[PDB]
Design a protein around this ligand. Structure first.
Ligand SMILES: [Mg+2]
Ligand SMILES: [Zn+2]
Lengths: 1340, 653, 34
RNA sequence: AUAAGGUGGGGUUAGUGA
């Protein structure tokens, strides 16, 4: 079952795997992001309210003046979209914010305010987006790419190996905040725990411990265990858990209960620990020299003298054991050390800190952070608070809190934004534990640590920057706030705000320009994931591994699609089915798999939560029950594929397409080719250029409906209806009654986009694909836009092709073509240029536009109007004059003495110059449109008046048709009220429709409805005039322009471009080609039937560049064409519906298990016919990515045709007239042409302009410039013996003014005689360093 | 300069000059006012940072910016770096009289000429048009000629038709690594606007026709035209400067055509008749009465110059094919016959051209090379060499070899299930048996392909080499190898992992079938790692050449003969196994230090100061001499140079 | 430990921080001396 | 010959098979 519209051309589909869940809406990232940017959301997270509530309320500098927040309300735009595309404005809505200002009384921060006030003040504009998601900034169409960046949180790294060449790893811990100061912990080979702040100089960690107000026994309390010696009978006997005896040899004969367990010579095994704890004793004796190797934990002081016996972090001496032995302190606290297990690392870190108390530690923090200034108490204190404890100057996101509490194994995902002590202490514990051997560091390229941003996050961030900077201003003006005289727009300036946000969308690393030459161009330019930008990487200092793919990329990032060149792998593109997390990670779909049953629900998985589970791969043959027919099945556990059991599984892949992007889901038979030529297939496939006559591709991939719809370059029926009125320009739909709203009945009118200039100077245009008197469906295509056909996306065209070397015109990769192709004109495209002519008012007067000119012939004057402007449609060539612009050089504008003597003598004088806008050289074409913008208060010209009234007339035509139809709805509603309550069907239409209130009707709500419909009638009248007149005020007015220009005249020139030997055109498999020779028809190869082939490729590209999918594609295209022309063979031959019905019924059965399963029997015998002439040019055939057709089916479908099974037909040359031995492969390949045409690549320069800092020719083509003779081919010249060549070319042809002038004279005098002179760039060099303090001269 | 409008694109230098004299004058007025030492102290420090901020910004601890928060440019960086004047505007300048566009083929040219478009020609030679146009008096004054070359009158096509008669031009491709990247041609004017290019130049340029652009130049003066035709002209360079191999080797498809020419199916039309001369063989082919790959005893006649360069006729009845006797007519006079009596792979035709250069000089090698290009595309096109999906043949034993292999990893795997083996041992045994089974599939598909053709021959049956298109394209040496067809028919490889180690499960499938999801996923790991390495590897390699071209830079062969007796001792190198580089190539073309004592005990074979060309190398090659002390450039006693007798041969001349 | 503070502002603060703020009657004292 | 022309940023093109 289908739409009525889908039955115009149903596509044959292969594919065994039943799809369970379709594609999502494609533009979902941009739309839910920036949708989430502006809406009235409560509860702060996430949005604008997070910005305002995050910063408001704001008080003065304790002057008890405070402003607060109420609400915001964003107004409508002043302009629509496409007019803003015309004029150059920002498509942007105003920002109106209700604040509130109070002022507290004196001696009363807490007291009642004396005065309040509230106004809704204005703060700049922010751009909207279109429903195609783009932004419009200054006439242009721009797209912001989402940024991949490192999630804030805490991380652990080795930096193994290569540092210090000692074979020893390090371990370092890093905190990344969302906004604030970095903080890094690390070790050394000498094994001390060092800390640095914001990548600065190195300090030991215990100084930041003392900075957090901790004493020494607290430190050694935390980071270690208490190890208990006690003064006892003799030699300070030991309390011991024999767990501590693991991993060390018995230093003495370790013995207890009078019993020797482990002697000297044995390590105490876990067997021996089991002996001891089996006896379960702790009170043992060590000899006293065991204690001299130990470090006391706490500080035992003397009792009598009250003095320090011994401090912490110092190794015991036996004499100190005597000093405490005579003291009588019975307890002795020490710490545990095992270099295998619990190394005493931070002890020596407490040795190398020179500091003692809180305050000095604060001093060296203050001195390392602001170096070179005298220390101060509270500057150090408040500085140290402002590095980590400030709600302004420091923040973790809630994402960062989530990553944090996950990382240190906490419980609840929420918490503070700034951090506290226990955070840091736990971090140091964790890093110590990795130093010990438990836990592990984590790779960065794991996708659980990379977070995507989006639009609204970044616009939020820039907006926060603007608000706090303008708040620095506001707090300044408020602390000096003179009361009762300030309304809150003297503190508020919108110009910092609008300066910040228009700075952002103007110039960013991520607000990059949109390329528009393809629906697939934009639709892959919006799903781009960059890793560059602010807070991002650089293209030149990323390693190989961050460019590399990671086994967490599966299903979330496309593996194969990346730009080749200077940034490979940094500009990754998103998958198909992937969505984003609430938090901003990459969630991916799966199927819930129960015990033996694959549940058909979907279920999203993050990155790190995936790894616990085990995943059924998509192409696993289950049999209708959830039950896989096998007992082992290919699954993946943790980044590895291995064969697992039948019941271990947890989840299944949704579909076979989730591994790839849309950029390669269009590739048919993608699985049969190498990744290199696949990558080149995608990226070259993007750059295709739309043709004149679009055409469907035979070997489709099933995605073409989705990308055709979701690209909004087609126009889709918003509601189900019936066609009323077809036109080439507009289209009119009668809305069906069920979807018709009860109030406001109405109809649908869509206005198609005609010929307009793209971003890339190409023709974008929409065509009606529907007939009249026809039911349409809600959500169905109506307008074929550019490179769209019948709701299907179709780039280039498909043609007959064959594989043989043919006289070397297909030597490397050059492509020979027949003349039939260009005779059908089926690669011809349209290009559109936009040219402008300005009119600045300078000193010595304005400038003029008219057809008055000095001293050119009447040839260019023939093709202007009376105003000096070319007519619409006058075909021009290069060098022609579009608009005659002249300057009055020598205009006077003097005193009335002048105007007196002008009245006396006449006005003859002050006429000179010309600066007419001329057509660029070598281009030609046809004018299709003129735009004129006029500065206000300047007199509009005649042609501006005609185009002005023409726009006016169009507008009143549109509103007039609106009032015709809605008026018909209202008075026809009045006939729909005068059915009951006095119908007069003869007397309703005698007088016209206006006096339908006042027939004989009772005193009820129906005559009342006649009255309020006379009301609605009246606001149709009056509102009709005010909308029409407001439109007159829009079009009539003089619009703003740049300061100093009077009028700008835009000219649209239209070029037709066919094809020429030297153009790049290519298939969909990385098979490039420059087209070599357009060779007449008679020399083509041709079959016995007589048909020419059209394009002859080269067989040598196949075995090296392994892309066999082109020849499989070629066979299948041969089969499809065989079916379609078999149909048309039965169709130009007269034949009834039955034979066609049976035949193409068979042609949709086709062997194996498919999802297609359709019948012809449910049809009208006319949509059978309509579909039959849709099939007479070929049969559209789908193919999924990995579940496409096999060899047996394609041989079967060739067998349905009359083509031979091998697919290699014999040929005949058109020149020899005889058979090639070894019959060759033919078939149909779908091919593209690319917009590298040779017309703008070809360039030369004899002698042009010169640069001024060095007399050297300019670079580039647009500047009519020469080539660079780089130094490598200089090395190639002196690699030969060519002496005169590079002296000549290096000097005369380039640098000396004298040598090139004289040599120019010698050529025009027929002499060839160079003159050396001296290169000018040497002269600027040595007078440059001569301007530096260096005496340099040229000697004798 | 101004930008578009009333604003002005500033220079940095003018900005900091403004700063420094503002600084100076304020310091002067402060000295006038007798300020305290704090202020004038501070100001002098400001002048210090001002002046060095002029000299070298950034070498002081923090730089300065004017706008865009971006550090402005001092005088020091105006010299250093990738766009200071040395590498930017002194070694590489932009040049007039140049053009640039996209290349294409046009094989009908001879190799001493190239295609050139009419528009680019009419732009590049405009002053010559002015000169001869003044000479003929078609227009007297200059601006008349300006509008004549603008308005396109028909007379000028005769004129630039005339002046491009013998005026050479240069071509350039942008990655100009070694010195064959610049060669010269004689332009033939072309309707259209792309540059047509002879095919044999493409391999020397490494310029595939995927869309490479090339640039051209014109030597203006007379002496440089003589340098072009004398040295830059493409007929000069046929041997590499790196080695004496020809670089005008036929590239890819002509060798397919010739390989298809000299072959034989075992029974064909005209099987084994007789014939007196190759013209009759041509009549038999174009008359279509015998097959092309069909053997026939013919009469041929040849020449040789054993005497004083003297060419002698002699003849016989060789047994050969048809097509060997066909392309025998293109070969010039001084060759042996048996140069063409085989299947003529890319190597055989390469050394064919090489010995043609060694024996018959220059010009017959040249015109011979053009002619074999013509017949190469002729019979390649008439051959009709396709490809098909049915051409790739799956070995039927593949399924069973994989089957026993997975049984074996089940056996070692169950040795690890009960833990009889360790991890790395199971690892290594599994990866070894996958290596072994992989090789079994490799010679499985090779043995299936290479000789699959089994046919009658006027009798019962006989095997011979295969007429499969792939096996011809790999066997002839056109493109690809056994490794790439191994990746087509048989299983492909064991792909590495991102760690740099190797994955235990091989990619069992092949490209003719479908790969799965994950095999393809592993493969795109390997590919991305590959071409990323190409990017950064290019970046390093250019820097290596950029460096050591500077350290040499200066050594010029300036003298004849140093007259010394030092030098080094050449021996054939042996790795420790086979000789991996023989004697005769390390010796070839380097003049000895002392005389070659023959190992006849006290016999002088070769004197002490002789060039060793091929005859001498065969001479001591026969006497099995093991070592020769030779003159080297490390021992040349020349001041500021190298004598030629310490260096030896040109290797392209 | 004067940390090469190449900002001249920083050291300029280090000199101007020597003299403390005078009250307004000390201005009477000094302008008296003037 | 009146189309000219600095500085940043972005996008793209062309550069192996063992
Ligand atoms: Mg190339
Ligand atoms: Zn020497």
């Amino acid at each position: 079952v289908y739409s009525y519209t889908e039955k115009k051309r149903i596509r044959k589909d292969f594919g065994k795997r039943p799809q369970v869940l379709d594609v999502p809406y494609l533009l979902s990232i941009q739309l839910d992001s920036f949708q989430k940017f502006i809406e009235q959301d409560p509860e702060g997270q996430y949005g604008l309210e997070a910005a305002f509530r995050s910063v408001f309320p704001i008080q003065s500098y304790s002057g008890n003046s405070e402003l607060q927040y109420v609400s915001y309300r964003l107004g409508e735009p002043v302009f629509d979209v496409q007019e803003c595309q015309i004029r150059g404005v920002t498509y942007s809505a105003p920002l109106r914010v209700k604040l509130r200002l109070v002022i507290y009384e004196r001696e009363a921060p807490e007291g009642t305010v004396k005065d309040i006030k509230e106004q809704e003040v204005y703060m700049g504009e922010i751009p909207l987006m279109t429903d195609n998601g783009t932004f419009v900034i200054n006439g242009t169409e721009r797209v912001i790419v989402s940024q991949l960046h490192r999630s804030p949180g805490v991380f652990f790294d080795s930096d193994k190996g290569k540092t210090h060449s000692s074979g020893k790893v390090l371990y370092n811990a890093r905190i990344i905040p969302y906004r604030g100061s970095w903080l890094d912990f690390e070790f050394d080979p000498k094994d001390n725990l060092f800390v640095r702040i914001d990548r600065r100089r190195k300090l030991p960690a215990t100084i930041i411990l003392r900075a957090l107000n901790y004493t020494t026994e607290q430190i050694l309390d935390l980071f270690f265990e208490k190890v208990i010696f006690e003064i006892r009978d003799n030699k300070l006997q030991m309390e011991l858990v024999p767990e501590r005896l693991r991993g060390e040899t018995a230093s003495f004969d370790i013995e207890a209960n009078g019993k020797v367990y482990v002697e000297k010579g044995r390590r105490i095994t876990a067997r021996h620990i089991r002996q001891l704890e089996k006896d379960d004793v702790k009170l043992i004796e060590v000899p006293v020299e065991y204690i001299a190797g130990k470090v006391v934990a706490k500080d035992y002081i003397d009792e009598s003298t009250g003095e320090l016996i011994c401090a912490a972090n110092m190794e015991l001496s036996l004499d100190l054991l005597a000093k405490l032995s005579q003291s009588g302190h019975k307890r002795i606290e020490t710490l545990f050390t095992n270099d295998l297990d619990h190394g005493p690392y931070i002890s020596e870190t407490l040795r190398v800190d020179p500091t003692n108390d809180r305050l000095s530690a604060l001093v060296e923090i203050y001195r390392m952070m602001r170096p070179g200034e005298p220390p101060t108490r509270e500057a150090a204190e408040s500085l140290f608070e402002n590095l980590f404890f400030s709600e302004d100057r420091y923040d973790l996101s809630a994402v960062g809190r989530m990553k944090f509490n996950r990382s240190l194994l906490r419980e609840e995902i929420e918490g503070s934004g700034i951090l506290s002590k226990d955070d840091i202490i736990d971090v140091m514990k964790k890093l110590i534990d990795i130093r010990n051997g438990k836990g592990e560091v984590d790779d960065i390229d794991h996708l659980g640590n990379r977070r995507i941003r989006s639009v609204g996050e970044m616009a939020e961030n820039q907006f926060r920057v603007g608000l706090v900077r303008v708040e620095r201003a506001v707090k300044e003006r408020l602390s000096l706030g003179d009361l009762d005289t300030l309304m809150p727009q003297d503190m508020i300036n919108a110009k910092p705000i609008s300066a910040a946000v228009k700075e952002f969308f103007g110039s960013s690393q991520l607000s990059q320009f949109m390329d528009q030459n393809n629906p697939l161009s934009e639709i892959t330019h919006k799903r781009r994931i960059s890793a560059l930008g602010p807070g991002g990487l650089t293209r030149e200092r990323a390693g190989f591994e961050v460019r590399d793919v990671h086994p967490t990329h599966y299903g979330r990032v496309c593996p194969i699609e990346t730009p080749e060149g200077p940034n490979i792998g940094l500009i990754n593109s998103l998958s198909v089915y992937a969505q984003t997390n609430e938090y901003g990670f990459l969630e991916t779909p799966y199927r819930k798999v129960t015990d033996g049953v694959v549940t058909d629900e979907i279920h999203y998985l993050s990155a790190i939560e995936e790894g616990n589970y085990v995943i059924a791969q998509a192409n696993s043959n289950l049999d209708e029950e959830g039950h896989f027919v096998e007992d082992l099945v290919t699954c993946r556990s943790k980044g590895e594929s291995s064969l697992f059991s039948r019941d271990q599984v947890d989840y299944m892949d949704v579909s076979t397409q989730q591994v790839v992007s849309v950029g390669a889901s269009l590739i048919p038979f993608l699985e049969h080719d190498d990744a290199n030529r696949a990558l080149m297939g995608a990226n070259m496939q993007r750059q295709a250029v739309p043709t004149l006559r679009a055409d469907k591709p035979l070997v489709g991939t099933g995605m073409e409906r989705a990308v055709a719809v979701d690209s909004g370059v087609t126009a889709v029926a918003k509601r189900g209806g019936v066609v009323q009125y077809v036109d080439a320009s507009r289209i009119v739909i009668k809305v069906n009654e069920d979807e018709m709203y009860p109030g406001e009945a109405g109809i649908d009118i869509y206005n198609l986009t005609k010929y307009t200039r793209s971003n890339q100077n190409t023709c974008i245009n929409q065509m009606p694909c529907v007939s009249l008197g026809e039911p349409v469906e809600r959500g169905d295509v109506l307008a074929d836009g550019p490179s769209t056909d019948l709701g299907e996306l179709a780039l280039g065209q498909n043609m007959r092709v064959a594989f043989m070397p043919w006289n070397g015109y297909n030597f490397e990769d050059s492509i020979l073509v027949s003349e039939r192709v260009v005779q059908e004109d089926r690669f011809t495209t349209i290009h559109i240029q936009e040219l402008a002519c300005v009119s600045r008012d300078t000193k010595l007067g304005p400038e003029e536009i008219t057809a008055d000119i000095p001293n050119v012939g009447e040839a260019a004057l023939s093709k202007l109007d009376e105003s000096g402007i070319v007519y619409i449609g006058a075909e021009v060539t290069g060098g022609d004059i579009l608009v005659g612009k002249v300057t009055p050089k020598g205009e006077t504008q003097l005193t009335p003495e002048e105007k007196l003597l002008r009245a006396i003598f006449g006005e003859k004088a002050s006429d000179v110059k010309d600066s007419s806008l001329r057509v660029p050289n070598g281009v030609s074409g046809t004018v299709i449109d003129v735009q004129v913008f006029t500065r206000d208060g300047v007199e509009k010209d005649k042609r501006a008046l005609e185009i002005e009234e023409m726009q006016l007339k169009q507008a009143k035509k549109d509103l007039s048709e609106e009032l015709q139809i809605l008026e018909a709805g209202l008075f026809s509603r009045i006939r729909a009220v005068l059915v009951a309550g006095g119908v007069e069907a003869e007397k309703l239409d005698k007088l016209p429709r206006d006096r339908w209130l006042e027939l004989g009707l009772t005193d009820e709500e129906k005559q009342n409805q006649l009255e309020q419909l006379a009301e609605q009638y009246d606001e149709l009248k009056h509102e009709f005039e005010k909308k029409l007149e407001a439109k007159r005020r829009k079009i009539t007015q003089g619009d703003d322009l740049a300061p100093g220009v009077l009028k700008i005249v835009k000219v649209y020139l239209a070029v037709k471009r066919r094809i020429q030997p030297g153009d790049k055109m290519a298939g969909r498999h990385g098979n490039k080609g420059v087209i070599s020779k357009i060779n007449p028809i008679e020399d083509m190869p041709y079959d016995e039937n007589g048909t020419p082939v059209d394009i002859v490729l080269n067989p040598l590209g196949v075995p090296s560049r392994m892309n066999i999918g082109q020849i499989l594609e070629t066979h299948l295209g041969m089969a499809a064409k065989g079916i379609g022309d078999k149909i048309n063979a039965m169709l130009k031959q007269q034949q009834e519906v039955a034979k066609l019905r049976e035949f193409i019924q068979r042609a949709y059965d086709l062997g194996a298990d498919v999802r297609q399963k359709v019948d012809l029997s449910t049809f009208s015998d006319e949509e059978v016919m309509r579909l039959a002439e849709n099939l007479r040019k070929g049969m559209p055939i789908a193919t999924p990515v990995f579940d496409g057709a096999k060899e047996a089916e394609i041989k079967e479908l060739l067998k349905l045709g009359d083509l031979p099974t091998s697919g290699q037909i014999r040929l005949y040359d058109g020149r020899t007239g005889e058979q090639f031995e070894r019959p060759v492969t033919v078939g149909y390949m779908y091919m593209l042409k690319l917009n590298h045409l040779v017309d703008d690549k070809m360039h030369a320069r004899s002698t042009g302009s010169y640069s001024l800092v060095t007399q050297q020719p300019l670079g580039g083509k647009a500047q009519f410039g020469g080539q660079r003779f780089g130094e490598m081919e200089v090395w190639a010249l002196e690699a030969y013996g060519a002496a005169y060549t590079l002296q000549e070319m290096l000097t005369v042809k380039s640098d000396d003014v004298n040598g090139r002038t004289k040599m120019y004279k010698n050529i025009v005098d027929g002499n060839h005689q160079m003159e050396p002179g001296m290169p000018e760039s040497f002269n600027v060099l040595l007078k440059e360093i001569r301007s530096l303090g260096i005496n340099i001269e040229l000697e004798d | 300069v101004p930008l578009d409008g009333g604003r002005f694109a500033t220079s940095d230098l003018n900005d900091l000059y403004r700063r420094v004299i503002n600084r100076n004058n304020r310091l002067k007025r402060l000295l006038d006012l007798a300020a305290p030492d704090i202020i004038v102290r501070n100001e002098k420090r400001m002048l210090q940072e001002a002046v060095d901020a002029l000299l070298d910004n950034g070498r002081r601890g923090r730089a300065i910016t004017g706008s865009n928060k971006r550090p402005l440019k001092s005088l020091a960086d105006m010299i250093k770096g990738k766009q200071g004047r040395f590498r930017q505007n002194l070694l590489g300048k932009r040049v007039d009289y140049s053009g640039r566009s996209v290349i294409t083929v046009g094989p009908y040219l001879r190799l001493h000429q190239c295609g050139l478009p009419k528009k680019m020609a009419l732009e590049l030679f405009k002053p010559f048009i002015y000169g001869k146009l003044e000479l003929r008096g078609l227009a007297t004054t200059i601006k008349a000629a300006k509008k004549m070359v603008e308005r396109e009158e028909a007379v000028v096509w005769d004129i630039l038709d005339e002046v491009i008669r013998e005026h050479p031009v240069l071509l350039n491709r942008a990655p100009t690594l070694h010195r064959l990247g610049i060669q010269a041609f004689e332009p033939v004017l072309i309707e259209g606007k792309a540059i047509q290019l002879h095919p044999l130049v493409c391999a020397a340029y490494n310029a595939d026709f995927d869309g490479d652009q090339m640039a051209v130049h014109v030597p203006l003066t007379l002496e440089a035209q003589l340098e072009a035709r004398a040295l830059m002209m493409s007929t000069n360079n046929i041997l590499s400067p790196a080695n004496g191999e020809p670089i005008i080797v036929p590239s890819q498809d002509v060798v397919l055509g010739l390989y298809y020419m000299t072959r034989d199916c075992v029974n064909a039309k005209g099987e084994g008749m007789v014939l007196t001369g190759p013209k009759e063989a041509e009549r038999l082919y174009r008359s279509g009465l015998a097959s092309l790959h069909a053997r026939v005893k013919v009469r041929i006649t040849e020449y040789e110059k054993d005497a004083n360069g003297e060419l002698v006729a002699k003849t016989s009845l060789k047994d050969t094919t048809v097509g060997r006797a066909i392309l025998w007519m293109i070969v010039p006079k001084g060759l042996p016959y048996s140069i063409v009596n085989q299947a003529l792979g890319k190597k055989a035709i390469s050394k064919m051209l090489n010995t043609c250069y060694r024996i018959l000089g220059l010009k017959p090698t040249v015109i011979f090379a053009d002619q074999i290009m013509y017949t190469g595309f002729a019979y390649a096109a008439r051959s009709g060499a396709s490809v098909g999906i049915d051409d790739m043949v799956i070995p039927e034993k593949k399924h069973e070899i994989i089957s026993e292999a997975e049984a074996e990893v089940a056996e070692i795997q169950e040795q690890f299930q009960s833990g009889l083996v360790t991890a790395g041992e199971r690892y290594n045994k599994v990866i070894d048996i996958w290596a072994a089974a992989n090789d079994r599939v490799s010679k499985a598909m090779m043995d299936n392909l290479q000789t699959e053709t089994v046919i009658n021959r006027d009798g019962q049956e006989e095997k011979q080499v295969s007429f499969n298109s792939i096996y011809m394209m790999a066997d002839s040496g056109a493109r690809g190898s056994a490794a790439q067809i191994r990746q087509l028919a048989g299983m492909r490889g064991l792909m590495a992992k991102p760690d740099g180690s190797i994955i235990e499960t091989p990619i069992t499938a092949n490209f003719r079938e479908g790969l799965n999801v994950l095999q393809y996923f592993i493969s795109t790991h390997g590919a991305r790692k590959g071409l990323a390495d190409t990017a950064l590897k290019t970046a390093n390699s250019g820097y290596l050449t950029r460096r050591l071209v500077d350290v040499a830079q200066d050594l010029v062969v300036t003298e004849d003969d140093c007259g010394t007796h030092e030098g080094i001792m050449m021996t054939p190198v042996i790795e420790g196994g086979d000789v991996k580089e023989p004697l005769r190539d390390r010796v070839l073309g380097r003049v000895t230090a002392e005389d070659v004592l023959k190992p006849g005990t006290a016999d002088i074979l070769v004197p002490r100061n002789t060039l060793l060309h091929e005859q001498w190398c065969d001479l001591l090659e026969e006497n099995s001499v093991d070592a020769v002390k030779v003159r080297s450039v490390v021992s040349c006693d020349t001041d500021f140079g190298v004598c030629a007798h310490c260096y030896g041969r040109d290797l392209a001349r | 430990e004067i940390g090469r503070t190449t900002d001249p502002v920083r050291m300029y603060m280090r000199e101007m921080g020597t003299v403390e703020l005078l009250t307004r009657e000390g201005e009477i004292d000094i302008a008296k001396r003037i």
